[PDB]
Amino acid sequence: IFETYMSKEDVSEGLKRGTLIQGVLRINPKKFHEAFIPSPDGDRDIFIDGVVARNRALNGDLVVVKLSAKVVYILEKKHSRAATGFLKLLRKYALFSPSDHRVPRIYVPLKDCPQDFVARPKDYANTLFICRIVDWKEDCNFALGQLAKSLGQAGEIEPETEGILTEYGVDFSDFSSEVLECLPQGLPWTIPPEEFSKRRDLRKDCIFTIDPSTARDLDDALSCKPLADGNFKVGVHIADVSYFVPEGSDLDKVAAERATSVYLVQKVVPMLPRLLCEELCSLNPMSDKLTFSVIWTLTPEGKILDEWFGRTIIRSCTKLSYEHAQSMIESPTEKIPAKELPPISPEHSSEEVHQAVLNLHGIAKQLRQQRFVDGALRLDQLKLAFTLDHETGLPQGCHIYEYRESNKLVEEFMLLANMAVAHKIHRAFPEQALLRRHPPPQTRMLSDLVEFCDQMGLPVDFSSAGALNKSLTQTFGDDKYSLARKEVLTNMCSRPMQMALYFCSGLLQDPAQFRHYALNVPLYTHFTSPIRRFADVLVHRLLAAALGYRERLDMAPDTLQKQADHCNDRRMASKRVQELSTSLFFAVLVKESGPLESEAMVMGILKQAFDVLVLRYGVQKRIYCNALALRSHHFQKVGKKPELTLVWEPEDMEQEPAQQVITIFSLVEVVLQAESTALKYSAILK
RNA sequence: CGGCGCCGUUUUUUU
């Protein structure tokens, strides 16, 4: 296919005789079948056409051409020889396609690909990987590459993470010696013989969990049983943490201080010791676990007929993921091969799990439709996620987070359980329930948004959460830029929004303030994850006291409010840390993958800077005007609509400077560049 | 409304 590179001595001889030319090759970023090099003497560049006549040279390499020319030798390879792209199947190879079309397509051997990739390849259809080119044979149109696992260098990533953690007050040290003495000290733990009498034994039922692929601990489980008259019996089963954490111990004090678990991209800073978090409390499959359950009989539409709260002993059958449950929903009348599913206990079959998934999905769909008919608000934006290596636990790939039917299925029943427990504990203890609320947005900014939308010709209503949801729903269909424009408008509409708060009901004396604005419900609380939240442990204690298992808590409403305030602060800090870790690893990706060119839509304009939204990578970056080669810049607010005009510094002294006006919803082109020595990156408007 | 004329502000589920 390609021509063999020439000998160095003949290249030197040809340079001496003068019939060969040197230069730097540049490839057209739009028509990839042509490239050129600057002329040594003439004004017109030397042209090389096609990819064969380019002869495996990449963009930026210093080459020798022979005369209409052709590359015959490369002196110094200046290109990084690293690319970012997507994997797919075509056997021993997988295909890797880069985002830059000046780089060829690369074979990656299957043993380098992720473990789950061969069985469920469609899970990795939009996951972004780095591949380094190690060869390019003469007889192949495809380079041979190596997939780059373990994004970054641990020598430099860890100090950055430590600084991020330290600037927010996250305690990440080891648990004390007195904390570990409050744990059970025995041999591999077994349930005491005196618990089987006071609990409900559900070890014979079919119960399972659905959680992310990178799940660390498991907090909740589901079961569904079809009844004889067309109804269903559905149960939600929560790990029993308050049994292992006695009130007033060093373990209790440390968990109260940390108040939440922090989930970094590469590790976790937990709230409880890894003996509990990983072995005794986590609902691992095929082990007798103590849980606390809520059980309903539901009509096929989702109506509650009777309700039961209790303590149970369960034994999970399988561990599903959000991509495993989705394959069940989308195949209602066909067998899923076991090779595409996780292991299951011999006591239960795969069909008894598939039928339960479908029967839960139908009810969840009905509940979701009715909830959005009753006037609920959903205000979600884009987010970014990373995959991990099974052998070591280091990130290697990066994709855009997707919300699907499995997520909605789990969310509906978690919401229903949370509302049920909220009502139960609020009836039981009016002055000590730990609830969660959300106030209505700010009036101030609303006028500015409605005026701006009227001027831009976007009819948006803000009288109610349901009207606002409908207004955001109807945004010029689902064209290429319709989704981006919806993203920008959602980002603008989420600015007047306020923040949700934990609180103790014994201090708010107005029933109208208990409401949750975005969900449009009179009462709410958090109940379904006590391992990674301490408010959940508190409500578990409260409900156990409500059912008569223990005595009423001695803790006061003032102490409950103080702990709620602490939980609010730590949840805020955890959110910021979890965002900054994703920013850090995307900076690592940019640094190792070179500068990335893309298209962006302006989300905001400031006096000397403007935010953009990188459409290809789903990230938001701010561009500063002082960092560009501009003759000048000016800012003008015409009514309520802002505008920024830029006058480029001309490259030469005969033509007039170019003026470019940028306004919101406009389209620009940007380049992402890695900083010299740091894990940061910048956006350049050129 | 705040912070220093210039900047800051979100809901839900799982981990």
CA of A220 to C1' of B5 (A): 54
My answer on whether A573 and A638 are in the same domain is no
DSSP code string of A347-384: TS-SHHHHHHHHHHHHHHHHHHHHHHHT---------E
Instruction: Give the nearest nucleotide to A501, CA to C1'.
Output: B11
Which residues fall within 8 angstroms of residue A292, CB to CB, at 6 or more apart?
Answer: A237, A238, A239, A240, A310, A311, A312, A540, A543, A544
Q: Please indicate, yes or no, whether residues A70 and A87 belong to a single structural domain of this protein.
A: no
Distance A680 CA to B7 C1' (A): 22
Rg (alpha carbons) of chain A, rounded to whole number: 30
| Burial (CB count <10 Å: 0-12, 13-18, 19+), residue A649 | exposed
A211 belongs to an annotated ligand binding site: yes
A319 shares a domain with A278: yes
A13 vs A235: CA distance, rounded Å: 83
Same domain for A281 and A414?
yes
Final residue of a structural domain among A27, A48, A76: A76
Q: Are A109 and A252 part of one and the same domain?
A: no
Which residue has its C-alpha nearest to nucleotide B8's C1'? A495
| Cβ proximity of A577 and A262 under 8 Å | yes
Task: Tell me: do A161 and A143 sit in the same domain.
Answer: no
Asked whether residue A561 is assigned to any structural domain, the reply reads yes
Number of domains in chain A: 4
Would you say residue A525 lies in a domain? Answer: yes
A282 and A310 belong to one structural domain: yes
| Cβ pair A590, A384 in contact under 8 A | no
The verdict on residue A410 lying in a domain is: yes
Domain boundary among A28, A56, A76: A76
- In whole angstroms, B4 C1' to A359 CA is 57
CA of A407: nucleotide with nearest C1'? B13
The separation, in Å, between residue A623 CA and nucleotide B4 C1' comes to 21
Helix (H) or strand (E) run with residue A598 in it: strand A596-605
With beta carbons less than 8 A apart as the criterion, state whether A127 and A397 touch. yes
Residue nearest to nucleotide B9 (CA to C1'): A495
The partner residues of A239 in beta bridges, in order of sequence, read A291
Residue A554 in marked binding region: no
Backbone angles phi, psi at A261, to 5 degrees: -95, 145
- Helical segments of A278-404, H only: 322-329, 351-373
Token pair of A131, please?
Answer: 């591949």
| Token output for A52 | 């064969």
Residue A467 falls inside a structural domain: no
CATH number of the CATH domain containing A48: 2.40.50.690
3-state secondary structure of A225: strand
Distance CA A344, CA A352 (A): 11
First-to-last CA distance in chain A? 37
Measuring from the CA of residue A441 to each C1' atom, give the nucleotide at the shortest distance.
Answer: B10
Find the Å distance, CA of residue A363 to C1' of nucleotide B14.
19
The residues near A410 (Cβ < 8 Å, ≥ 6 apart) are: A210, A222
**Breaks in chain A after (C-N > 2.5 angstroms):** 67, 90
Instruction: Please give the nucleotide, over all strands, whose C1' is closest to the CA of residue A277.
Output: B15
- CB neighbours of residue A459 within 10 Å: 9
Q: Residues near chain B (nucleic strand), Cβ < 7 A?
A: A 211-212, 214-220, 263, 377-381, 407, 410-411, 414-415, 418, 436, 438, 444-445, 494-495, 497-500, 516, 518-519, 526, 528-529, 532, 606-609
Report yes or no: A664 and A452 within 8 Å, Cβ to Cβ. no
Could you identify the residue whose CA is nearest to the C1' atom of nucleotide B5? A607
Q: For residue A96, what is the domain's CATH number?
A: 2.40.50.700
- The CATH number of whichever domain residue A642 belongs to comes to 2.40.50.140
Give the closest residue to B12 (Cα–C1′). A378
* Residue A375 CA neighbour count, 13 Å, CB half: 11
A528 domain residue, yes or no: yes
Distance CA A426 to C1' B7 in A = 42
3-state helix, strand, coil in chain A (%, to 5): 30, 25, 45
A514 found inside a domain: yes
| In contact, A150 and A158? CB cutoff 8 Å | no
Q: Answer with the one of A532, A558, A583 that is the final residue of a domain.
A: A583
How far apart, in whole angstroms, are the C-alpha atoms of residue A555 and residue A202?
33
A301 shares its domain with A426: yes
My answer on whether A530 and A575 are in the same domain is: yes
**A480 part of a folded domain:** no
Our CA angle for A412, A415, A418, nearest 5°, is 150
Nearest nucleotide (C1') to alpha carbon of A438: B11
Chain B bases near protein CB atoms (7 A cut-off)? 1, 6-15
Q: How far is the CA of A213 from the C1' of B15 (A)?
A: 9
Q: How far is the CA of A443 from the C1' of B1 (A)?
A: 12
For A642, how many CA atoms within 13 A lie in the half-sphere containing its CB?
A: 15
The separation, in Å, between residue A23 CA and nucleotide B11 C1' comes to 57
Q: Are residues A612 and A653 in the same domain?
A: yes
- Quote the domain boundaries for residue A34: 8-76
Looking at the structure, do residues A279 and A204 belong to the same domain, yes or no? yes
For residue A346, what are the contacts with CB-CB under 8 A and spacing of at least 6? none
Find the residue closest to B15 using CA and C1' atoms. Answer: A215
Distance CA A505, CA A435 (A): 7
CA A246/CA A227 separation, integer angstroms: 39
Q: Are A281 and A537 in contact (CB under 8 A)?
A: no
Check whether residue A71 and residue A105 sit in a common domain: no
Query: Per the domain annotation, does A485 fall within a domain?
Result: no
* CA A626 – CA A633 distance, rounded (Å): 9
Q: Report the distance separating Cα A394 and Cα A478, nearest Å.
A: 36
